[PDB]
Write a protein that binds this DNA or RNA. Structure first.
Ligand SMILES: [Mg+2]
Length: 876
RNA sequence: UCCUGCGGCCUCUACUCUGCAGUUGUGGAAGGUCCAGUUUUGAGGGGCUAUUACAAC
RNA sequence: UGCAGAGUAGAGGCCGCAGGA
């Protein structure tokens, strides 16, 4: 057999990249050896596989690791191992349905053997090699089988092209239609992977292109491109052709996979402040909205708009990567633990389902350090031992106990919910991440945060950090936290009085009202009876609203089933610490069951529907905690469908609540399932009991305006701030005064653009020819003045608006109340939307000032860079 | 002096797969919402509210 | 009816690297 001419003519390239291919392979094999604590087919990792089915496996955990990781690092091995199974079934007349270690070993033995051969030939001026002799063992056993394997591999690789790059039949036909002749392999095809290579025995070997393909399985995409570009393997397709790109992509599609910063965060911050906040974008004219839109080269619109407020996560990354806090660490989530409670759980619809329980893996540390701890080399979580399930593992509703517990793979992120930031205060510096311990493979032992801060406090914290330094900032948070702790310890000793409350160093406006009540001698619980009376009335009114709306409308059964499932559980009495009420899976089933319920007045189907509520122990004889009125819904007859069920449910609800109202009116005591007299809400608070809950059970709720006194003392010392009344100056105000007076800066120009609000339309009172209300775009000065005149202007608005209701025929004979109510709600909602929107945009301004300031500080102290000249006003 | 290819970061869109959607307790300094001769200075006042979290099923 | 995670793809911004004329 002759060396292919392509190989002989491009020897320096085949030489170079064959060596690179073999080194890359060894690298993977070496990595796997190290992580698992185990002539490349004699590598320890490959020996292991060779011997793995020599009797009963003594190291199954190692075998399985090797098989899994080999298929990760060598993606082509999934295809080739599958072909090797099918081959062996042929050879030994078997029906093995599953790939095993023998398949994997054989594929890689051959691939490595041929790669080694060509490596040796192409990296030597002259070596007469025995392995090229026609009919020899090497050719018959290794090389010729490999050529057929490679050819079958490529069939599948081209199929993968469709999935991966969206190529169509027409795109790939220049290869797919010409590979095989009529079925033979068309060795005359320009991209043929097999040839006779002047073998007198006339057996198919790897062609030059075939050898290039083998090599490229073991290269990075960068080197695939450098290598193939040197080779005349593209017939007449030119550098810019799609066909050339298809060929190259086909040679990389399943190839080897080889095993944030201060600067990056700074640049993430600057790219945040150039984007439009979403609340602002809504209010802008189409012209100004257009200013945030780009058309790309490929004629695609791309929108520079914030999808969420990333101020706080950006700030947390800034602190973490900067190593700016010695003691404080933020609350991170690192995935979920899933454990199998029961493989066969009978549900309230009488169908059996796997019952899997989840727990979040919450902890405290710097995002990078926590992330390094989360995923061990051996693919377990932290120091737990428990496996992290990978993307390749796809086993839905898996019922096998051996597969549990496992941990969902999720990158460490900060937990940022309910506008809060939770943190843990370490006594010592350079503490390790606080990962949760797992107990009995089932409980995730989490840690109550030290303290919790409003995300609305983060601007002032940032500002304090910028003026004083992160270490002084941190000492203040820690000192505030320790003041609250001293207070709560004194409460537990009953040593807090009106006479000494000031000594604790906490302003009245930052003490819980219950402490203030307790020292003033005015401690009281809420009035449960008042609450019952009010709740019953509110709910009766709502029930009638829903009855009317439904008759009028006659509709999403999904929407109906949401209402019904919530309400059914609301009215279910609790016993035994709430252990009797409907649990998550059964709740999902009940709600879905309702949404799709539609007997054809089929008796069995009706019985089945009723039975569900019997099994949930809501209706039926012998039930101890029944729903108070649901059983009336099924008295006389079962409703035929979800819509009938909703109607009957609401009527029965109305009768129940009317009864309650009537008993309340007689001065009698009533009880509802979901109001519980034994809850602390209803009792008088005690100093000592409340002391302990505040110290031990909850995070410290950090006060607003923690940093104000220190911020204001600093700024008072600056001469540029001389003419500021610090007695009417909040931190939002002072950030902007700092930017203007000390830095000669201002906010981004797009915060001066005119905005639209329905409420301001109503207050402006301007109509078109047809009589519709106009969408104005106002300045802030205009809105200031409309708002001053809102009483008069609201009067005008209502007068006109009411007339326009009675002009329309549907609401023509409408009561004074009906109209007045419709308008009341219209103006309230609009006014509230406008006020909140304007407040939030004013926060976005000063948040952007702070990101800009911090980013600029990072980059100033980096690089061959100077940036004293740069200003937020220039950002667009 | 630019074009082709590769890696990292962040965002958006499409697709697949896998999962979740409940209870009780505690907690209204904080968060949400509503009222006003309140704020364009998440500043302040009054009312209503378990929403983050943690524990247990 | 809604939410979450991972993978892949595509489009885009910024940074870094390689190669050919
Ligand atoms: Mg305050």
């Amino acid at each position: 057999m002759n060396i292919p001419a392509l190989v002989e003519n491009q020897k320096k390239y085949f030489g170079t990249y064959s060596v690179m291919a073999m080194l890359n392979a060894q690298t993977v094999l070496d990595h796997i050896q190290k992580v698992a604590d185990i002539n490349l087919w004699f590598h320890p990792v490959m020996s292991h596989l060779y011997n793995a089915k020599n009797g009963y496996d003594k190291q199954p955990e190692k075998t399985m690791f090797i098989i899994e990781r080999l298929q990760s690092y060598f993606p082509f091995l999934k295809i080739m191992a599958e072909n090797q199974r099918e081959y062996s079934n042929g050879k030994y007349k078997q029906n093995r349905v599953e790939v095993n270690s023998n398949d994997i070993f054989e594929v890689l033995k051959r691939a490595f053997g041929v790669l080694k051969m060509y490596r040796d030939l192409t990296n030597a001026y002259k070596t007469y090699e025995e392995k090229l002799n026609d009919g020899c063992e090497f050719l018959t056993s290794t090389e010729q089988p490999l050529s057929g394997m490679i050819n079958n591999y490529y069939t599948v690789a081209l199929r993968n092209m469709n999935e991966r790059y969206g190529y169509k039949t027409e795109d790939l036909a220049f290869i797919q239609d010409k590979r095989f002749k009529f079925s033979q392999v068309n060795t005359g095809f320009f991209l043929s992977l097999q040839d006779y290579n002047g073998d007198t025995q006339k057996k198919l070997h790897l062609s030059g292109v075939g050898i290039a393909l083998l090599i490229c399985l073991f290269l990075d995409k960068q080197y695939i491109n450098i290598f193939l570009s040197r080779l005349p393997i593209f017939s007449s397709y030119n550098a810019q052709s799609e066909e050339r790109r298809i060929i190259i992509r086909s040679f990389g599609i399943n190839s080897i996979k080889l095993p944030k910063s201060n600067k990056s965060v700074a640049m993430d911050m600057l790219n945040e402040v150039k984007r439009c906040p979403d609340e602002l974008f809504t209010t802008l004219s189409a012209e100004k909205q257009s200013r945030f839109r780009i058309i790309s080269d490929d004629h695609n619109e791309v929108l520079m708009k914030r999808s969420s407020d990333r101020f706080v996560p950006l700030l947390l990354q800034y602190i973490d990567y900067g190593k700016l806090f010695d003691h404080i660490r933020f609350h991170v989530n690192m995935g979920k633990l899933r454990y199998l409670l029961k493989a066969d759980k009978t549900c309230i619809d009488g169908q059996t389902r796997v019952r899997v329980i989840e727990q979040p893996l919450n902890g405290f540390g710097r995002l990078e350090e926590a992330e390094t701890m989360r995923k061990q080399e051996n693919g377990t979580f932290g120091n737990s031992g428990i496996r992290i399930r990978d993307f390749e593992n796809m086993k839905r509703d898996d019922a096998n106990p051996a597969n549990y517990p496992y941990i969902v793979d999720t990158y460490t992120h900060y937990i940022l919910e309910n506008n809060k930031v939770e943190m843990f205060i370490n006594d010592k510096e350079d503490s390790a991440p606080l990962l949760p311990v797992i107990e009995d493979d089932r409980y995730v032992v989490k840690t109550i945060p030290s303290c919790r801060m409003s995300t609305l406090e983060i601007p002032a914290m940032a500002f304090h950090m910028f003026l004083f330094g992160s270490k002084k900032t941190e000492k203040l948070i820690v000192d505030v936290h320790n003041r609250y702790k001293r207070l709560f310890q004194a409460m537990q000793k009953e040593e807090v009085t009106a006479e000494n409350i000031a000594s604790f160093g906490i302003a009245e406006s930052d003490l819980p009202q219950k402490i203030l009540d307790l020292i003033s001698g005015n401690a009281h619980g809420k009035d449960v009876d008042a609450f019952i009376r009010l709740t019953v009335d509110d709910m009766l009114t709502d029930t009638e609203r829903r009855i009317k709306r439904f008759k009028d409308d006659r509709i999403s059964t999904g929407k109906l089933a949401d209402f019904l499932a919530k309400d059914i559980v609301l009215f279910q009495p609790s016993v035994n610490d709430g252990e009797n009420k409907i649990t998550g899976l059964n709740y999902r089933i009940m709600q879905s069951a309702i949404a799709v319920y539609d007997s054809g007045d089929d008796y069995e189907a009706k019985q089945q529907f009723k039975l569900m509520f019997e099994k949930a122990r809501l209706i039926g004889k012998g039930t101890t905690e029944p729903h108070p009125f649901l059983y009336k819904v099924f008295a006389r007859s079962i409703p035929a469908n979800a819509v009938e069920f909703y109607e009957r449910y609401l009527i029965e609800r109305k009768f129940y609540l009317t009864g309650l109202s009537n008993e309340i009116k007689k001065g009698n005591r009533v009880d509802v399932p979901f109001i519980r007299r034994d809850q602390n809400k209803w009792k008088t608070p005690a100093m000592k009991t409340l002391g302990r809950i505040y110290s031990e059970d909850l995070p410290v709720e950090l006060p607003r305006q923690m940093f104000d006194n220190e911020i204001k003392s600093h700024l008072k010392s600056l001469p540029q701030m001389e003419g500021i009344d610090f007695n009417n100056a909040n931190v939002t105000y002072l950030i902007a005064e700092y930017m203007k007076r000390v830095l000669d800066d201002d906010f981004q120009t797009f915060y001066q653009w005119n905005r639209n609000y329905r409420y301001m339309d109503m207050l402006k009172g301007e109509y078109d020819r047809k009589g519709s209300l106009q969408h104005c775009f106002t300045s802030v000065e205009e809105r200031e003045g409309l708002w001053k005149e809102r009483a008069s202007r609201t009067e005008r608005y209502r007068k006109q608006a009411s007339n326009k209701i009675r002009s329309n025929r549907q609401m023509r004979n409408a009561s004074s109340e009906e109209i007045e109510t419709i308008l009341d709600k219209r103006l309230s909602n609009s006014r509230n939307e406008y006020q909140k929107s304007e407040k939030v945009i004013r926060r976005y301004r000063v948040q952007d000032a702070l990101l800009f300031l911090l980013a600029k500080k990072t980059l100033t102290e980096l690089a061959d860079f100077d940036g004293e000249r740069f200003k937020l006003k220039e950002i667009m």
